[PDB]
Amino acid sequence: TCPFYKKIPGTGFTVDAFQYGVVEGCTAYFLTHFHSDHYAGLSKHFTFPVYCSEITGNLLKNKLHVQEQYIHPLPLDTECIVNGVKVVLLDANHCPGAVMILFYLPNGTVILHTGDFRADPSMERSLLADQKVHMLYLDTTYCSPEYTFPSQQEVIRFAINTAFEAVTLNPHALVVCGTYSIGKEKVFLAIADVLGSKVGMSQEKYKTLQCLNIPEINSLITTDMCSSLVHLLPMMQINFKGLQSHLKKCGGKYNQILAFRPTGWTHSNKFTRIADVIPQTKGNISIYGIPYSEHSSYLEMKRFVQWLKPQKIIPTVNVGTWKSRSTMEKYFREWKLEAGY
Ligand SMILES: CS(=O)(=O)N(CC(N)=O)C1CCCCC1
Ligand code: NI
């Protein structure tokens, strides 16, 4: 049974709704981004129209093997008509290819679905500036004031400086970065750039990255592990056992590992500053957890919503408990009373 918050009223449209079989009345299925909780259910046998970004379309075709005739890519920042309804895709500042969707309903209502997003003041000068939005379907992942983290720029500065220092001190150190989905590519690309290396990875991860329209990508990544001193591994292998095992396979080329686990928020944000972050260490292996978020902080979310001034908000994350739902509704009312809308 498809839940109400994945349906767009007054249309034949759903958003991120592929795990419910054939949804009654759905003439077009929108996909905001290529993360498994959102695409769950799509495969080579899907036979309905899918609307998405070009990058998402590349991943559907090459990784899930969806047939080309059912993939409908749309350009960003461009008014398009889909099954008689005007829509616009906007950059979500999430992972590559991720979008927000603006729907202009036949009755005059305007709906924004954020998909997953990291709110930014730059969104205040998109096509959102032009008109009123009545309903907002909101990525509420971190909708509580305890959720603080630094800018992406500050986290990358920390990672670059940390990696460059370690490898300049010991030229026989290897850098490893964890991954389990698309997103957060800047972490490993920025470290490899400062070290003058390509990023080495499996054939499967190389395939994924080749779908993302990143400029000059062939100059930045490789499947030749022996040529690279920055390696990507599955996130599950970023632990002392898994890294010890990987070091053995490198044939005495290296005598130290510096590893990075880009998490979302963790409780150590409530205590510590980014500059003060320290690794976990056992012998010649050190592991850094770095708070690189592709979701809005509480303050970023609050600013976006108080700017947009929607008439109704529908959360799309943390919807499963009465405590979470009550907490979110209390913040939405606070924000409106403070701003005066
Ligand atoms: C826009 S708001 O004031 O924050 N809001 C809560 C919400 N979920 O939109 C409600 C206001 C009263 C009518 C239902 C909507
Ligand atoms: Ni996501």
Curated annotation (Swiss-Prot):
Top-rank lineage group of the source organism: Eukaryota
Chain's role: May be required for DNA interstrand cross-link repair. Also required for checkpoint mediated cell cycle arrest in early prophase in response to mitotic spindle poisons. Possesses beta-lactamase activity, catalyzing the hydrolysis of penicillin G and nitrocefin. Exhibits no activity towards other beta-lactam antibiotic classes including cephalosporins (cefotaxime) and carbapenems (imipenem).
Part of the whole protein covered: 700 to 1040 of 1040
Protein family: Belongs to the DNA repair metallo-beta-lactamase (DRMBL) family.
Residue ranges crossing the lipid bilayer per the database entry: none
Expressed in which tissues: Expressed in brain, heart, kidney, liver, pancreas, placenta and skeletal muscle.
Subunit field text: Binds constitutively to TP53BP1. Binds CDC27, which is itself a component of the anaphase promoting complex (APC). Binds PIAS1.
Induction and repression of expression: During mitosis. The mRNA encoding this protein contains an internal ribosome entry site (IRES) in its 5'-UTR. This 5'-UTR generally suppresses translation while specifically promoting expression during mitosis, when cap-dependent translation may be impaired.
Places the protein is found: Nucleus
Originating gene: DCLRE1A
Protein name according to UniProt: DNA cross-link repair 1A protein
